[PDB]
Write a protein that binds this ligand. Sequence first.
Ligand SMILES: Clc1cc(-c2c[nH]c3ncccc23)cc(NC2CCCCC2)n1
Length: 324
Amino acid sequence: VTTVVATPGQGPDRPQEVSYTDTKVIGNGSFGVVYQAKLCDSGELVAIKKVLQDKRFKNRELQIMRKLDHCNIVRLRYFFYSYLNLVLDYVPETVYRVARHYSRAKQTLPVIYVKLYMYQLFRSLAYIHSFGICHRDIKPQNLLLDPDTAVLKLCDFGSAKQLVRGEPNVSYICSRYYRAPELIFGATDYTSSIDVWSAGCVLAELLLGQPIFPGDSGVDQLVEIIKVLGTPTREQIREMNPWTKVFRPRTPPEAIALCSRLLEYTPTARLTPLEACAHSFFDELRDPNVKLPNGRDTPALFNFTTQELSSNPPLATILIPPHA
Ligand SMILES: Clc1cc(-c2c[nH]c3ncccc23)cc(NC2CCCCC2)n1
């Protein structure tokens, strides 16, 4: 039974006495440890990300977390010190685990879940990007989901950085399979369109039932890309610095259409997260009768803020269906 005095994530600096029990480890990455705990009062489950802290500089992930507030991004409930502790919402499953179950069971995830999960990912991207913040590590392991509610929540802002024009950033960010070609070609002038490529990679993976561009070397990855995308033009190569034959037979044309538009050589040619949310493939979530397979209601999909829509406000005509 641990009792800390922590600062709430969002809101005014008014510290609270937070008490928790049943502290078990749940993850152990390079970044540090992730624990699961039960808050004594609420009885609610939480995840605590324990990272080492430099007096040298103030934690960037903490700085990024504190400003963020979206239905499709984990909540930083509290944060304290020891070294830096992130008391975040507990979310049971991950797109990684879900996709794996399905591939291990030789079937694919029902298209309703693909549309639901992808849209929510694109929304969190539309939001984060409308602050010049790039996630830099979109992978199914970082896409948390509650299976009953069907809500997806982006997590791991450990490598997220606010991208400023003219400022160069490391090309070694991003995990194998989801790396945008600019990154494979070691570009330092990359934009938030890198997250869109990674998002597109997740879409295709849920559709194919396995990674679209695998390989342990950049070379191997680039080959699997050229196999589907074709050979990049000298201009396409410069911008950096099949399709219907790719997917199984009854794959929605709209899903394949959405892929081609996200998985573009030219970082400029790729859809913006908002543009993707407004794609024909998501038209079913816009249906007033749309319900989850378990009979439950779909999560909030249209509560678009001025902030979220800032990217290009006219899209709200498509984004918010008349029934709202
Ligand atoms: Cl910041 C951040 C937060 C969380 C997180 C928030 N709620 C959760 N509920 C259940 C499991 C993890 C979480 C996870 C990660 N990813 C790690 C999970 C453990 C294995 C390595 C990756 N990062």
